[PDB]
Amino acid sequence: IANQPVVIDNGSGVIKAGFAGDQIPKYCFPNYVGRPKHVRVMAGALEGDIFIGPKAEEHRGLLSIRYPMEHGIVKDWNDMERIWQYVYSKDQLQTFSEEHPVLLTEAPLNPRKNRERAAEVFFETFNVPALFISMQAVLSLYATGRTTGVVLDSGDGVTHAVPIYEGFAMPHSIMRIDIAGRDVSRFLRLYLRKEGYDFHSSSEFEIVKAIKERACYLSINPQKDETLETEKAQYYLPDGSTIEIGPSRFRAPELLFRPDLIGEESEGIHEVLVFAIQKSDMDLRRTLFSNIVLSGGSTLFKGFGDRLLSEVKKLAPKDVKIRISAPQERLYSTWIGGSILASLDTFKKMWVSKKEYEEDGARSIHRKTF
């Protein structure tokens, strides 16, 4: 028994959290940790070293922003502890980690050590009454209400497709590549350098993310538009300068459909969907093609869904109704799905109790991983 389950949606770029039963996540902020770079000289300065959340975003110039999680895998656990601890601070939740069971979203095909050490972190430093690690696609489909269909997500560090059949997420059809939002921003940074504009500071990579979020689009024809000179719209920096982008705005999110530009034998998003559908039972292909759900912030580019339809039509068999849905809460899909899932009475039997974790250990988590 506890108060209420807290759905903490992780993400390599933006963490999202709130209590279960909530409508929208009330607490969302970037998943980075910024510590100052300069020298504390004057007294009365910004006290404290590590900053997370709105304060780290505000005084962005001083920090040396780093990410503790990359490609859905935690690289530094200390920064993650401070991030989770920040989630439970007075600025976000104002609660205690002893009276709340925790729903935790997590990307597929990740190492066992993520669930194991993350569970140790929660049940030991936080001592939560109940932890429950789950997928992300299952939650997104629960958020849309329907039940069978694939889920195409592309967050900040991962991207995958999961063919879900009535909740049983088919584990033998989850294609997963590691080319997501942050990497698109990284490649955009490279193209900005090729344009002439240099951005290499860690607290400037964020400006590159801002440019990706408000100045890029997806060309329908990938090559016909490359053979033309666009209008070259400008961009206003926080500094007040001006950057004319040019061709570095459509080729930047082109990476998601062709990771040859980054030099990698992986596949595009369209191939992840088509391979995820084709590596399933032939009796469900039409049902999966009639139900595609997008989620994740990288599915917010202009002309994304339209280009995805064109690509899938080029790869799907002829005269099969393809249908891509795209709800208005792609950033909040996994969190809303967590709010629906954890607010049910079956969640009591679906979690892992603290007592159980102390009895068996990590094997209990891998046992009851679904």
Partner 1 sequence: MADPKYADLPGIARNEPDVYETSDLPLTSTSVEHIIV
Ligand X SMILES: Nc1ncnc2c1ncn2[C@@H]1O[C@H](COP(=O)(O)OP(=O)(O)O)[C@@H](O)[C@H]1O
Q: Which residues from 8-27 bind partner 1, rule CB under 8 A? A: 23-25
**Cβ neighbours for 257, distance < 8 A, ≥ 6 positions apart:** 222, 268, 269, 270, 307, 311
Bridging pattern class, strands 130-134 and 73-74: unpaired
State which of residues 239, 314, 328, 359 lies at the interface with a copy of itself (CB under 8 A): 239
**Residue 173 interaction partner, one of a copy of itself, ligand X, partner 1, none, beta carbon < 5-8 Å per kind:** a copy of itself
82 or 285: CB nearest a copy of itself? 285
State which of residues 252, 308, 341, 365 lies at the interface with partner 1 (CB under 8 A): 308
- One-letter amino acid at 112 equals R
- Of 15-23, 89-97, 159-167, 212-220, the segment contacting a copy of itself by CB under 8 A is 159-167
Residue 232 binds a copy of itself (CB under 8 A): no
- Report DSSP state, residue 126: I
Quickly tell me which residue has 């009475």 as its tokens. Answer: 345
d(CA 218, CA 331): 19
d(CA 316, CA 147): 22
215 or 350: CB nearest partner 1? 215
CB of 129 to a copy of itself, least distance (A): 21
Residue 250 binds partner 1 (CB under 8 A): no
Q: Which of residues 164-223 bind a copy of itself (CB under 8 A)?
A: 164-173, 178, 190, 193-196, 198-204, 207
Q: Which of residues 60-119 bind a copy of itself (CB under 8 A)?
A: 60-62, 64, 73, 109, 111-113
276 or 352: CB nearest partner 1? 276
**Residue 23 interaction partner, one of ligand X, partner 1, a copy of itself, none, beta carbon < 5-8 Å per kind:** partner 1
- One-letter amino acid at 161 equals A
Residue 146 binds partner 1 (CB under 8 A): no
Nearest CA-CA partner of 133 in 241, 302, 8, 274: 8
**Residue 325 interaction partner, one of partner 1, a copy of itself, ligand X, none, beta carbon < 5-8 Å per kind:** partner 1
3-state secondary structure of 19: strand
The dihedral through the CA atoms of 90, 94, 98, 101 has a sign that is negative
Tokens of 49: 């070293």
End-to-end C-alpha distance for the chain, whole angstroms = 21
d(CA 182, CA 365): 30
d(CA 348, CA 356): 13
- Of 4-12, 99-107, 214-222, 240-248, the segment contacting a copy of itself by CB under 8 A is 240-248
Partnered with residue 16 across adjacent β-strands are: 9, 28
CB of 128 to partner 1, least distance (A): 26
**Phi and psi for 15 in degrees, rounded to 5?**
-85, 150
Residue 59 binds a copy of itself (CB under 8 A): yes
**Residue 155 interaction partner, one of ligand X, partner 1, a copy of itself, none, beta carbon < 5-8 Å per kind:** ligand X
What is the contact surface with partner 1 in residues (CB under 8 A)?
A: 23-25, 28, 297, 300, 302, 304-306, 308-309, 313, 318-332
